[PDB]
Amino acid sequence: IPDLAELETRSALDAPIPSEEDKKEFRPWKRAADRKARLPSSRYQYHPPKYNRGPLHPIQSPPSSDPIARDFVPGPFNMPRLKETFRTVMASDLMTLAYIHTPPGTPKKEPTERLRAWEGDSPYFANRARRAPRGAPELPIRERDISFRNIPEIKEITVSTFVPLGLKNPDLLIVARAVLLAMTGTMPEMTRSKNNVVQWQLQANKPAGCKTTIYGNAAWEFMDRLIHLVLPRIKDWKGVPASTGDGSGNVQFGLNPEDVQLFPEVECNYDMYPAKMIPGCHIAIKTTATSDRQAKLLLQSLGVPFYSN
Amino acid sequence: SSQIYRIKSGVILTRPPLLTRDLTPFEESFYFYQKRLNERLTAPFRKDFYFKKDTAADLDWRIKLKERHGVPAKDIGRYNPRGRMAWNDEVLVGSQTSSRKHMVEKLLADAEMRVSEDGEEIPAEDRVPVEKPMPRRTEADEKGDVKRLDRALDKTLYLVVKKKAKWMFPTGVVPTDEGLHETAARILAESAGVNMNTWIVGRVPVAHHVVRPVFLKKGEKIFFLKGRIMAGQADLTDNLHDLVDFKWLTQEELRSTLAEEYFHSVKGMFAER
Amino acid sequence: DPRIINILRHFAVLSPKRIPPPLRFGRNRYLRHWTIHRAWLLFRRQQREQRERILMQQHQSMSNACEELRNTEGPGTRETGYLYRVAMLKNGVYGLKSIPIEYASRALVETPGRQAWNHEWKR
């Protein structure tokens, strides 16, 4: 076939598997020793720049996927058992549970302008500025239906701490930053206060907390630890409040300082921290959902109890 | 003026997989490949942050750390991130280190207490191993008992029942009082018993089977609902329907038991595993 | 102070000046990684296409069944689409007791427990 004649004649992909005899004779450690010298360096010595100086600069930076890049992060190390669970059993139950049948020839719904315009016979309406968002001061995202093309999933988790007393005892901020480190496996970024309150002895623009964001597989692993190993150990725990939700599919709740040390990563070396310095955290679970009821329906699929309050 | 179609309502009761699927030969090699790049890019491990000097935990950590040749990790073999030979991070083909069997073996050998309460190393013969995990394939898997729910723990099992003979799912006519969702519950209880912790997903049917009429003989419009079993076993004693036997079958075994047309209608409901 | 110094050392090791540097590959080593990356992203495509194929096939089975249900009459003296209009209700779907916590809490595991399944469960 002429089309197949345009493909590369010599294909590495269509080569036979390596020979066992060749495998036996391939010893990378014996080459460096037998050489008894240092092989000359290659003339290609491009190294990613430390700064991005524009799209037209002679020296350009590679993408993060490039292993030599400065922002490269080693890929997945395992499959979070809660992501395989959700995609294996709970992906179709939520799709089947919440399903509305659309007839075959249903006309596509046309979205109406959310920033209305004035229409009428008054000459003033012509050049009037678009009206304000009706209801809330900011337009809320419209809920999408749970389809086979839109399955709510967990996206990222933000663990934040606020230590006001750390302004007087600087060590309260050092411990808080370490607990949030072992808990999530990343380096928290210090935050600062934004208001001034003398009654609470709060001064503005001073480091008073820390925050980490875990994405991808890390966020699915953290959820499992929280659901199956931390929350089941909180004494007299009722469940996540049914009122949680910002109206966009994100669930927020907080842990006590005595419940933060239940994390296996914090109870192992609990004695290495000064007494009464482990803080409480604010866990914000951001999902792909677009509603409060969808997120609460998503978390219930992962084994989160919710109580009325 | 008799109705042409006889509306029925069934229930496709399923037991989800209880185990994670086996990792492909490439998924294992890839994870191991990335675990060694993490060794070259992550900060070193500070034992002083978890173990305090001259304790039962510190001494136990130092002994086993020397057997691993300084590598604090237990599932990446022997690799030094720094030094002249750091480049040799890749593993040759046909290796055992990257497999998951060797991973679990090393993580278990590192959990046994190697230092007595007094700080002395325990004799090699006096060291008690740790209880190993249970096997993936249970006894029912070896025996092949289809009436068991602990069989094929990595696959979905479907409840199929024989009626005085043709195999099918628990079905029954829909009365005028009950809907599809509340009829599928009454039939499952009158066919397989009430000792099953089942959850009917919802009201929406996941599949349907239509047997046209014979111009006459009344046709049947069977609508199936999805059921999820969490505990118990089916019991066919004192059943109202003329049911004889039952068996929990996989997706590949269903097509060998159910009819071709009956299977072609419910296959769309099947899942990956 | 001693314990806080330990915590500070943990951070001193994570500073940009202490963390290891970016990797430095040759050509054959870089090309070796280029394929492992090219084959992994393609593997995810094969798993993404398969996963999205099952979701579409399971979804089409519902559309077909519900479409048939819409045009049914019965059982008995019930207008067309009664069962359909009753099946599209979402009563309790978005409540607190929607999904049983015994089914959602049980996640997949590499190896089973001492008792994989409990057959002696009684109502």
Binding site: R70, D71, V73, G185 | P72 | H10, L14, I19, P112, G113
Partner: peptide
């Protein structure tokens, strides 16, 4: 001139988690 930051990640292990049920995951 936008600085290209680097990721600062600590050392991580692989752990076997054995639940009360006797089941184990990594």
């Amino acid at each position: 001139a936008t600085f290209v930051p680097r990721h600062r990640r600590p050392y991580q292990f692989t752990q076997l988690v054995q639940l009360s049920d006797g089941s184990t995951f990594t």
